From a paper:
Acinetobacter baumannii produces the catecholate siderophore acinetobactin to scavenge iron, a nutrient essential for several metabolic processes. The biosynthesis begins with BasE, a standalone adenylation domain, which activates and loads 2,3-dihydroxybenzoic acid (DHB) to the phosphopantetheinyl arm of the PCP domain of BasF. Several binding pocket residues were identified within 5 Å of the ligand, including Asn242, Phe243, Ser247, Val336, Val344, and Tyr346.
The activities of this double mutant with 4-fluorosalicylic acid and 4-methylsalicylic acid were comparable to that of WT BasE with its native substrate DHB. These improvements in catalytic efficiencies were mainly attributed to the significant reduction in apparent KM observed with the mutants indicating that the mutagenesis likely improved the binding affinities of these substrates. The mutant S247C and the double mutant S247C/V336A showed reduced catalytic efficiency for DHB by more than 10-fold. The double mutant had significantly higher activity for salicylic acid (∼3-fold) emphasizing the importance of the hydrogen bond formation between the Ser247 and the C3 position hydroxyl group of DHB. We then analyzed the structure of the double mutant V336A/S247C, which exhibited both an increase in space in the binding pocket and the introduction of the cysteine residue observed in aryl adenylating enzymes that bind salicylate. This mutant demonstrated some of the highest increases in specific activity and showed improved catalytic efficiencies with the 4-substituted analogs, comparable to WT BasE for DHB. When combined with mutations that switch the specificity code of BasE to prefer salicylic acid, this activity can be further improved and be comparable to the activity of the WT enzyme with its native substrate DHB.
Residue numbers in the entry: 3 to 438
Write the structure that this text describes.
């Protein structure tokens, strides 16, 4: 009956963020509902040989949601989802959003140790995974959960066994009986993001419908998405970068289409780009290097790429400059964190800004301090530690009061651990990382 706990913005900041129109108090399912009303038959997801329209995505994820409701899963409960880069990922995401189940999307690369830690932390009543994943290849991990009194009530499996509940069976058909359901309230937790770079297993980041939808809408505007955007989803779909910056959710917000790839391997990605005339992609620097190494051979297959976002690791200027020369598309640098703040070079920034900086915040109410070791603001342009708060930056990790008191200051700035300097033009350069 209690909704998932999380650390709230002050009411004065919530009001401000509503007054500015950042927080519009709609569930994240707004993206689907609006697109179904506007363009039900536009393609939402391309996955392998499948073409999911907006109304198909909407009907498939309602089916799953009615099935879960039928089982007493709803507001107050949590789910652990671990799916590869396939359409069912988003069907499941929107299904849990619709049903009011707070979902943690594990990376498909996470193994038993991480999944165990997540299950201990959110005690999910629903687990959704794939039988082709190493961890669910046998029944050992699911069995270990009974021992520890953490068995979920429902396990749905992709590529399922005859014994299992088939995830695709619960998507294909709605429940036999009607049980009511609804999203969690727009200013309550919608789902858990995961931190990057924390010491042990990733820390849980509660995200509300209000703040995630804002970052998605605002990112989609900055990146200039529209209904002809076709975005390659080659990075892990659950990752903040791939999901909201502007990510699949931004593309759906804009009425475009997400094109799935299993991973960023260049030859296969290039084939998907050519086949579906992908015009946007998002990559981390190591994946850009791989593409850069094949792109001359395949210039023709990737001509349609119009925009490449790059972020997630340091991206030297020498490499940035190769993106337009070799990939024949525009560069946008992105520096963000699942905890909130996202920076983009703008599409009309100068070439030097795009090649040498990681841009500037989504929001004019993204507040930045760049501080020395005495936590005093450095002189303009020097390197300091980044601290930030704003309308989509979280206010604390899930159930971690001790850690939270260490990375938030008294004004509720979050200390991301990133080292940065502000350039004269107003943009940020990420130059490193600092501990504790
Ligand atoms: O987590 C990251 O490293 C990351 C990178 C770019 C972006 F736009 C958002 C992000 O969360
Ligand atoms: Ca907005
Ligand atoms: Ca981080
Ligand atoms: Ca191009």
């Amino acid at each position: 009956k209690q909704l998932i706990e999380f650390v709230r913005w002050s009411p004065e900041r919530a009001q401000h963020y509503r007054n500015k129109g950042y927080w519009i108090d709609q569930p994240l399912t707004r993206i689907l509902t609006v697109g179904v009303q506007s363009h039900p038959h536009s393609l939402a997801i391309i996955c392998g040989e499948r073409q999911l329209s907006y109304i198909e995505l909407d009907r498939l994820s309602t089916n799953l949601a009615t099935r879960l409701a039928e089982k007493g899963l709803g507001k107050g409960d949590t789910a652990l989802v671990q799916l590869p880069n396939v359409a069912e990922f988003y069907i499941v995401f929107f299904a849990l959003l619709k049903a009011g189940v707070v979902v943690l999307n594990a990376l498909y690369s996470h193994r038993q140790y991480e999944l165990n830690a997540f299950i201990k932390q959110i005690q999910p009543k629903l687990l959704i995974g794939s039988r082709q994943h190493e961890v669910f290849s046998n029944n050992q991990f699911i069995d270990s959960l009974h021992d520890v009194n953490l068995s979920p009530e429902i396990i749905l499996m992709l590529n399922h066994q005859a014994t299992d509940f088939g995830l695709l069976d619960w998507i294909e058909t709605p429940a036999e009986t009607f049980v009511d359901f609804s999203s969690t309230p727009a200013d309550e937790v919608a789902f858990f993001q995961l931190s990057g770079g924390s010491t042990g297993t990733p820390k849980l980041i509660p995200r509300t419908h209000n703040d995630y939808d804002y970052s998605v809408r605002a990112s989609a505007e900055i990146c200039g998405l529209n209904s002809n955007t076709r975005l390659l989803c080659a990075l892990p779909a659950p990752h903040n970068f791939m999901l909201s910056c502007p990510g699949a959710l931004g593309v759906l917000h804009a009425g475009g289409c997400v094109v799935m790839a299993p991973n960023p391997e260049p030859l296969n990605c290039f084939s998907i780009i050519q086949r579906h005339q992908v015009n946007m992609a998002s990559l981390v620097p190591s994946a850009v290097i791989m593409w850069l190494e094949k792109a001359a051979q395949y210039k023709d297959q990737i001509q349609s790429l119009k925009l490449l976002q790059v972020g997630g690791a340091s991206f030297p200027e020498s490499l940035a400059r190769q993106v337009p020369e070799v990939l024949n598309c525009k560069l946008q640098q992105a520096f963000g964190m699942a905890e909130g703040l996202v920076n983009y070079t703008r599409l009309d920034d100068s070439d030097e800004q795009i090649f040498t900086t990681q841009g500037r915040p989504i929001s004019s109410d993204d507040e930045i301090k760049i501080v020395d070791e005495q936590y005093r603001e450095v002189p303009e342009g020097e390197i300091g530690m980044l601290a930030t708060r704003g309308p989509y930056t979280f206010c604390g990790y899930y159930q971690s009061p001790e850690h939270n008191s260490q990375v938030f200051d008294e004004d509720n700035y979050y200390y991301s651990g990133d080292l940065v300097q502000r350039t004269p033009d107003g943009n940020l350069r990420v130059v490193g990382r600092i501990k504790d």
